[PDB]
Amino acid sequence: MHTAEFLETEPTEISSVLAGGYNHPLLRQWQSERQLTKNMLIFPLFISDNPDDFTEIDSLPNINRIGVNRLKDYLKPLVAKGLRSVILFGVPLIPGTKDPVGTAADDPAGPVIQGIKFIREYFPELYIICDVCLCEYTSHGHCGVLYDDGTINRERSVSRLAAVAVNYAKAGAHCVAPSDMIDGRIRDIKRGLINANLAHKTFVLSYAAKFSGNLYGPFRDAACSAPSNGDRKCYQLPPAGRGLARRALERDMSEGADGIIVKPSTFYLDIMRDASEICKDLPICAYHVSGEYAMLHAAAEKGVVDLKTIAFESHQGFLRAGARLIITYLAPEFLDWLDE
Amino acid sequence: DDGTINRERSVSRLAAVAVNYAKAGAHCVAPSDMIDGRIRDIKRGLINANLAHKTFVLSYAAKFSGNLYGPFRDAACSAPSNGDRKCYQLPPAGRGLARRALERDMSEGADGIIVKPSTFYLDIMRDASEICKDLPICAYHVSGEYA
Amino acid sequence: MHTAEFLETEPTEISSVLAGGYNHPLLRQWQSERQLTKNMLIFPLFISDNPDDFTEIDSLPNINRIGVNRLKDYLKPLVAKGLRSVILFGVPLIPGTKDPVGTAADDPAGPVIQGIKFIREYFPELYIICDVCLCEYTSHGHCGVLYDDGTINRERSVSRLAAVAVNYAKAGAHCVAPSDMIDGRIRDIKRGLINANLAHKTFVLSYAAKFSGNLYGPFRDAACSAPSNGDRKCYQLPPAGRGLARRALERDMSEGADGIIVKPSTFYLDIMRDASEICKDLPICAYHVSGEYAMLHAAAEKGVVDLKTIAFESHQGFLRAGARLIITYLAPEFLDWLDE
Amino acid sequence: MHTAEFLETEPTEISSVLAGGYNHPLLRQWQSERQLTKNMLIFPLFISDNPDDFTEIDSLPNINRIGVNRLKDYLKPLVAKGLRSVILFGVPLIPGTKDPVGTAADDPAGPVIQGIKFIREYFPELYIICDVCLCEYTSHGHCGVLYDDGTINRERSVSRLAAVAVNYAKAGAHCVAPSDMIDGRIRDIKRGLINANLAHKTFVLSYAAKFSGNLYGPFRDAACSAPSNGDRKCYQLPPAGRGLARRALERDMSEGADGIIVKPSTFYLDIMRDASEICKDLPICAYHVSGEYAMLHAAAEKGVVDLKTIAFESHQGFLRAGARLIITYLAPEFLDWLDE
Ligand SMILES: NCc1[nH]cc(CCC(=O)O)c1CC(=O)O
Ligand SMILES: NCc1[nH]cc(CCC(=O)O)c1CC(=O)O
Ligand SMILES: NCc1[nH]cc(CCC(=O)O)c1CC(=O)O
Ligand SMILES: NCc1[nH]cc(CCC(=O)O)c1CC(=O)O
Ligand SMILES: [Zn+2]
């Protein structure tokens, strides 16, 4: 008869015993290197050039394209729930706005600057972050100014990007986040802020590690910033490029970045860990991209996972990997969940 | 009797099982129990059975508790009863414990280590690549991630 | 009677047991830090100024000096077998071509640029690397412009080398590999590419660690680039110079190199390991030189070793030492071997 | 007309200039981390059980199988030339000597112990090293005692190996070098020496990093120690196994090794470098194996390289990689070369 066999054992080694550290709910909280708080949440906003807008973005569950006149009523509850910061994304829909040099990017009458002014007035305590790029304002849909061949033109690009960033800061943005990924733009932006006497009041949140991938889909729907005549594989880091990512982190830090953003998040947790070592003295931010966000929702609907559970798991993962800030579309949910 | 894991009896039983699989012909054994010090007993068992030189010990050194093991419980019908595995599997926020578990398993004889889940724990894989730099690291794309 | 003695033993220590990790064929593959793939192979090419050339190089078994008109038929099978990249070497044979400043180096009608144009046209998917130096175009046979005393003239040399490199890139080369070993040439080449607006499309593969030795023989036959009035012991690193090699690696990296090459390979595996630590974020390439290559062939003929076996052993050694790319004359063989 | 182009240059950067450190012959010597001296050379000896032997080993140029009665006249000149140490290898040719447990390994009447006694008497100042293994004394040709299945039997093996090592030391060997590569043999050998009260006088030179390869050929001819019924791929490290090699080095050191040997040499220079970091406080020895040695000779005959030149280059390479001792068949040559 097959019976249960038990091998002869040796006395337990103290070094084997780890269980004493997480056998209680409170202990699992104590084991966390960083605890998730409401003030680490950064909610993205898609401001449209139509002040009465409030359009739902198909590929982005529960997220819409808001116009200035609908901002107050939208923000009120969130701010009351503890929202401390937002990241602005402009979505100029009016025809004849987009061009080869992203002129509309810093248009004072544009959605971004209009949004900055509104928020600084209606929600003076909110921290305003502005994404800096040309992709949503270029006729070609690329992040910077191009060469006749269609390839990125570094010099003209960073020159234009620096202007945009300084202009947002001039309008009142507390922080600028260049997501272009073009070589040396951080240095030009920092120098520009210095020359404009705004470097002491403007936080530079660089998307130091932004990889190219299949997770930016839904975003291209909410802001209509899709490439034309190719992909961003030449500026955004290759998914397998750890060395380049590490070099980009060191570069951006050396160029003046006050903090860095890792995008995507979950799919690049190892890069977040690398960043926490290289940029140990700077705040690291995780960006839970549209694709990752939409992926969780899809899986949830399919019953593969539980929304709240996986959201907490994924977000706690960012903190474990070293991040202390999080840009997520789940901000509204967390402002609630963190209360309980 | 209280329902809590019994380390001694557990590793004693697990070691027997692992050695038996190797005796049957398995080239490698991967303990996914996550119970304190099972790697040492399994390695010692293989040594005593004269199979340690032919059996690769692939330890699930870093196995976190989470919401991604669902589908697996359907394919093998191995779902907990009267509680969860939160007392043996590492807490999602537990980086320190994970690092300590990696060092422990390595020191106990593991020939390679497995990180589970994968995608949701890429940072732990990176930690493992430094701590267990001389050993092969394996990623386990779990049912939940796959689904 | 002498009998076999067995000392009293103690229970086996777990820390002693390593055998569990490599007792199976698959395991020995899992133990490899990097696995050899077809796309890591870089095949050198010796383009002659005689379009109908196809001369065999005595000291270089199975290797010849090809002319443009024989390139198509030579490359076809290789590319079909998986060849992804080649490294061009010009061998201008026409008299009155060589001079004191290597004028012919970037001659648009020369073998290198002619080769670039041909390949970009007939094999558009092939990655083109060009070795950058003056040794094969100078009347004196040295790597750079000389002083009246015969000693290397840094300034004029790097100035000329930078021009050559930019010109190859202008012709269409995807990557440039300066093998001159002259102080600070990487910086001038990078700056030159920047000024020519080609730095974003040109990979700079620096021969950061190139030692002087007895293994470059056969090469001097295939390209006729032998020194005149001395040796290269003043620019190429001394075989015992580890400190200088480490300093050269850091220097080249800091000067803009995108990747580095270690030459020779087998005889300098320790330097490859040093490079994998210093230049951890950059791709490291091993160059299996003519002497090493010819040495394996000789030993094989003598029956000392087996060609295929030692080739795999030596090449796997490069990967073990940290390289992820390999320039070897055995490329054709590997394109076959890797299939089985 | 194509003219030589010279790009505009910037003032030379001090950090680019490395040339000032190796522009003179003496400087290239100063750049060496370690200089090659006669006392670092260890000459191998193949003692036969036929006292009047002096047979030439085909696959091993200029090397023979010597009997005790021919040892004096062979050693005299070498010792006079500066030879300070030798490594003994036994080659029992008498029939019925080899068996399943390598009984003859420590046979007092065997070549090794007979050699130790002779040398200690005729050349009292010579340092005697003995290779420790069973391969040359087993009927199966393997390094240790086997299981019925043909697989290595760790326990019985190290038990037998420890006895052999202690016996050689008892006979008068100053140092023992276990080249078996069987898990934990160093610990048993050290413990055995301790129990025999010889640990304070016996240097344990472990072949901590011994890889399996295609370079041990000629050796199997000089000592007739070739495997039977398989290869040594289960005990000797796989060529791609850097992790295992590093673990083996740490293990052997922790087990009592006083020094370590890296075999092969040239083909494993990166491992020598790894060893120089892990075993920084212990002397590292490079073993220029028969295959590597025969390879140099073959290439030399083929005119691919110059014997003396490549020998110096390869041997200086060991020192560069971190070794301070060298076991080489070129010892006789170096005892001459180092004089000039
Ligand atoms: N330069 C645009 C930008 N800045 C931030 C991410 C958006 C992240 C998301 O998809 O939610 C993107 C889109 C892109 O890179 O294509
Ligand atoms: N001890 C069971 C075991 N071993 C491997 C994973 C399966 C991974 C998967 O879900 O695909 C599980 C399930 C569990 O931990 O609940
Ligand atoms: N600057 C020429 C150059 N670039 C690459 C190596 C060729 C490597 C080989 O010999 O195969 C050489 C020859 C030299 O340094 O003498
Ligand atoms: N255990 C035998 C032993 N000890 C040293 C090397 C000899 C090195 C040489 O080939 O010169 C060998 C041979 C082997 O490993 O097959
Ligand atoms: Zn953009």
Ligand SMILES: [Zn+2]
């Ligand atoms: Zn040259």
Ligand SMILES: [Zn+2]
């Ligand atoms: Zn042996």
